[PDB]
Structure formats: structure tokens, C-alpha cells
């Protein structure tokens, strides 16, 4: 399913992930299209920072959902 | 374990991965001079209670707290 990652600069990134993908996997995919190390980035959704352990299904990320990227 | 505390200045603290909130406010008082009874630590949008520990709120390495 295609999701979105709205950076903190207005830019919106389109990712293709499965509901069974962990956050570490998502951050890995973001690195491929931005070159940003997973350890330099944090993901916020529904008003909560995503743990690198859980998956998308755990945080209940559906199709066409949009995460926000906040560099650290 | 090393952590941070945003007062506008910032202080670096060396504590244990499971140190209680009470033990932290004790160290902050030694470095800043602020009485524990007059300092509130905020993290993850939720205020830390002196009854719990750091491991509870998942205070990882180089985490950043806030004094209010």
C-alpha cells in the first residue's frame, strides 16, 4: 500500500510498504530516497513517535496514510 | 547512561538506565541548585512522577527532558 511521509519542509514522499513492515523497515526505505540515516530521523503519527520495534499494523497505519518526518 | 535536560541552558546528566525520577531530580539539584520539590520534568508529552523510574517512560540514551 502506498503511504506518504510529509517532511518538515512541506515536501511529501511517496512510499510503498506492507502493513507488516516494521518502523525500522520504513526508515530504511526513506533512506533510499533521501539518504537520511534511520538513526537521524524520527516518525510521528496520530500524535505519537513510532518505536523501531513495532510495525505498521501495530500503530494501525492504513492505506493512503501520512507520517511526518522530524530529523534529530 | 547520558541524558539531557532543557531548562534556556542545557545540562548533561550521567545516570543509570533505570534510575528513578527522584534520583534524577537529586542530581539536577546538585548541578543547577533547583530544589526537587520545585521542578517538573516533562517527556513524551507526559509529566514524570517521582514514584516511577526512567526505564518506565522508555528514557533511552541521549534522551532529552524538559524542566518546568
Amino acid at each position: 500500500m502506498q503511504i506518504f511521509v510529509k517532511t518538515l519542509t512541506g515536501k511529501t514522499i511517496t512510499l510503498e510498504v506492507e502493513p507488516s513492515d516494521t518502523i525500522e523497515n520504513v526508515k530504511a526505505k526513506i533512506q533510499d530516497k533521501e539518504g537520511i540515516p534511520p538513526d537521524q530521523q524520527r516518525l510521528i503519527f496520530a500524535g505519537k513517535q513510532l518505536e523501531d520495534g513495532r510495525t505498521l499494523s501495530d500503530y494501525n497505519i492504513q492505506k493512503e496514510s501520512t507520517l511526518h518526518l522530524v530529523l534529530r | 547512561m547520558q541524558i539531557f535536560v532543557k531548562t534556556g541552558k542545557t545540562i548533561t546528566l550521567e545516570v543509570e538506565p533505570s534510575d528513578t525520577i527522584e534520583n534524577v531530580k537529586a542530581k539536577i539539584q546538585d548541578k543547577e541548585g533547583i530544589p526537587p520539590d520545585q521542578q517538573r520534568l516533562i517527556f513524551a508529552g507526559k509529566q514524570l512522577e517521582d514514584g516511577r523510574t526512567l526505564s518506565d517512560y522508555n528514557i533511552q540514551k541521549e534522551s532529552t527532558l524538559h524542566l518546568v
Partner: peptide, 30 residues
């Protein structure tokens, strides 16, 4: 006081006692 507010920048649910986003430092009111 107040109630937990969502940082307009990344929707992060911050604490009322704070005036800036805990994740991006973006102010609460603008």
C-alpha cells in the same frame, strides 16, 4: 492549566506546560 495539544508541524501530542513542539521545537501558537 490546559490540555495536551497536537504540534501543527508533525501532529505530535505535546504537553500543556510546553510552548514549543517537543519534536521540532515549533511554537504552539502562530
Amino acid at each position: 492549566e490546559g490540555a495536551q495539544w497536537n504540534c501543527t508541524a508533525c501532529t505530535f501530542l505535546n504537553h500543556p506546560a510546553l510552548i514549543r513542539c517537543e519534536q521540532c521545537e515549533m511554537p504552539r501558537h502562530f
